[PDB]
Amino acid sequence: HMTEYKLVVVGAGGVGKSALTIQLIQNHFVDEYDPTIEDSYRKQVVIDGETCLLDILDTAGQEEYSAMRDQYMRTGEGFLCVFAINNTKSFEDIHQYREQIKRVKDSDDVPMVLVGNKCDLAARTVESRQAQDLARSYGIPYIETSAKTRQGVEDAFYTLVREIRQH
């Protein structure tokens, strides 16, 4: 049996956080997505030579069901904490998400990555140095991704798997 990594995407709604996972799963030259099937949230990958399966939970659209976060978070081994580089409130919310993951997993050391997502051509309000300083204060990696080009997407997820393997 190959290793299966249960990953959870968390972050503010309304800022295109869903693009991260959709871009990962859908083939690099395919744009036809159906979220109502198994293959839409599962992907077999080779990372550092070791083949594995990534099971990704993204509840984008369910942000108002705030009392269901703990339930959703407890399913994960690793977390992608996503904010939009054009939405400072989504960046400021990260601290709350991380603290909630730590409370749910009952651990101060939970495999986690910070992801700054460039979700449109609106102006950047969060400088890479701000996010790099925040990620450093938490002791975690920071990865920036582009929703249009797929740049950084694989690096974000693969870095998280490495964070789990090196836990």
């Binding site: 693009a19 997505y33 159906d34 949230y41 993204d58 659209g61 703990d70």
Partner: protein, 452 residues
């Protein structure tokens, strides 16, 4: 083959090509019609009012999702343009009137009828759109169309105006004694029934206008998705109320009674097909302040542990068991809305608005069909109501629940967690004891009705 006018005098006469319309490989299952994948707005309007056949699925899909690629004002103009068929520059002319003009003209009137009947919100929100629709409908002349023109006018005016259920169960609280109503004093069967009625009505009030274009996630969500948001907030509120009930009962024996009663309410939600109610309970049990209460869980009867565990398992593996179980039941039910919300959002975000063929932009209609399929599934569970009597005082109690009070989310959430730590400290701190808070008996009347 017929002779239609030139594209210079009539845009809908332009022939089909790879540059203006594309299809899926399959056909409509019950109708034998091709499935349009993409096309220009002109071609989508042409097929919305096609002369060869009626296409109710396409009309329904189109009218539910067109606002992402065409404005109401622009659609009305396009259909008024479609209706005004010029005669081409006798036998050929008499056939054109019976095989092209009469069918197309009747198809635009049918679209007008469906628009006003099922999507009147466009007219409520833009009184000039309605003025123009009535101006147009007033100009339509013909004995064939008088019937359809009259019916539309009747809908506009209507739209412009705007056996025995079981015996209500009572436990410690008696009818009218609203001051004593609480989790352990109201009958668990009646809590579940009255919550199912509230939650069914909330579910049934959500319209596709609140979902198409992912508008419940946008800055104007309070304007555009008010009924959906009320529904999610009721749900969130009940979860928090259950968690509050648990962690504020400091005495272990009393807290075990509280949890056991919530599991009974869950068991009745399962009987009633209230999956929203079920997941409200599962969410409270999986919350940080409750999930860690091991001394409470251990004291729960084995049958109730298994009831809860099976409910919990419905959410596992991306709602695999929940989804199978929802497909197997028949109405009335109260689905969990969250799955639909995620599916609609991801369909819209994971698919392009336009496809390009030979440098020409085609509206991606299949993306819209996929969203209309999800909204159709929501609607199929909104038709059937429950055969349950409303108890106006219990209903009002649950409507006015406010476990958070004036506190903000974090403040209340931290208070619940600190109460959890107090009542059952982290190991190796021993378990304290706490005095009883209930002056009435904790024994449940069970989940089976008291009278036949």
């Amino acid at each position: 083959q017929m002779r239609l006018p030139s594209a210079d005098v009539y845009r809908f006469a332009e022939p089909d090509s790879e540059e203006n319309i594309i299809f899926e490989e399959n056909m409509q299952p019950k109708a034998g019609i091709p499935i349009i994948k993409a096309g220009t707005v002109i071609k989508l309007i042409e097929r919305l009012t096609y002369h060869m056949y009626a296409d109710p699925n396409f009309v329904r899909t189109f009218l539910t999702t067109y606002r992402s690629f065409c404005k109401p004002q622009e659609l009305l103009s396009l259909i008024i343009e479609r209706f005004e068929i010029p005669e081409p520059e006798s036998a050929e002319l008499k056939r054109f009137r019976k095989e092209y003009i009469q069918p197309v003209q009747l198809r635009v009137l049918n679209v007008c009828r469906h628009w006003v009947e099922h999507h009147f919100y466009d007219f409520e929100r833009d009184a000039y759109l309605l003025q123009r629709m009535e101006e147009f409908i007033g100009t339509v002349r013909g004995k064939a169309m008088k019937k359809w023109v009259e019916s539309i006018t009747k809908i506009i005016q209507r739209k412009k105006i705007a056996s025995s259920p079981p015996t209500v169960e009572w436990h410690i609280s008696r009818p009218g004694h609203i001051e004593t109503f609480d989790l352990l004093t109201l009958h668990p069967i009646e809590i579940a029934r009255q919550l199912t009625l509230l939650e069914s009505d909330l579910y049934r009030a959500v319209q596709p206008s609140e979902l198409v274009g992912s508008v419940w996630t946008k800055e104007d969500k309070e304007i555009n998705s008010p009924n959906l948001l009320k529904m999610i907030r009721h749900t969130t509120n009940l979860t928090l109320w259950f968690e509050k009930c648990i962690v504020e009962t400091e005495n272990l024996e009393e807290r075990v009674a509280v949890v056991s009663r919530i599991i009974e309410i869950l068991q009745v939600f399962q009987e009633l097909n209230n999956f929203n109610g079920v997941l409200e309970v599962v969410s409270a049990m999986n919350s940080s302040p409750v999930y860690r209460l091991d001394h409470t869980f251990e004291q729960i009867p084995s049958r109730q542990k298994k009831i809860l565990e099976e409910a919990h398992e419905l959410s596992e593996d991306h709602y695999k068991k929940y989804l199978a179980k929802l497909r197997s039941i028949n109405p009335p039910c109260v689905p969990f809305f969250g799955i639909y919300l995620t599916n609609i959002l991801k369909t819209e975000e994971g698919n392009p608005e336009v496809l390009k063929r030979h440098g020409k932009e085609l509206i991606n209609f299949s993306k819209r069909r996929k969203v209309a399929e999800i909204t159709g599934e929501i609607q199929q569970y909104q038709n059937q109501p429950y055969c349950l009597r409303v108890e106006s005082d219990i209903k009002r109690f649950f409507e006015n629940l406010n476990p958070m009070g004036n506190s903000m989310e974090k403040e209340f959430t931290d208070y619940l967690f600190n109460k959890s730590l107090e009542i059952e400290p982290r190991n190796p701190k021993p378990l304290p004891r706490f005095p009883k808070k209930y002056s009435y008996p904790l024994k449940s009347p069970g989940v089976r009705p008291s009278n036949p």
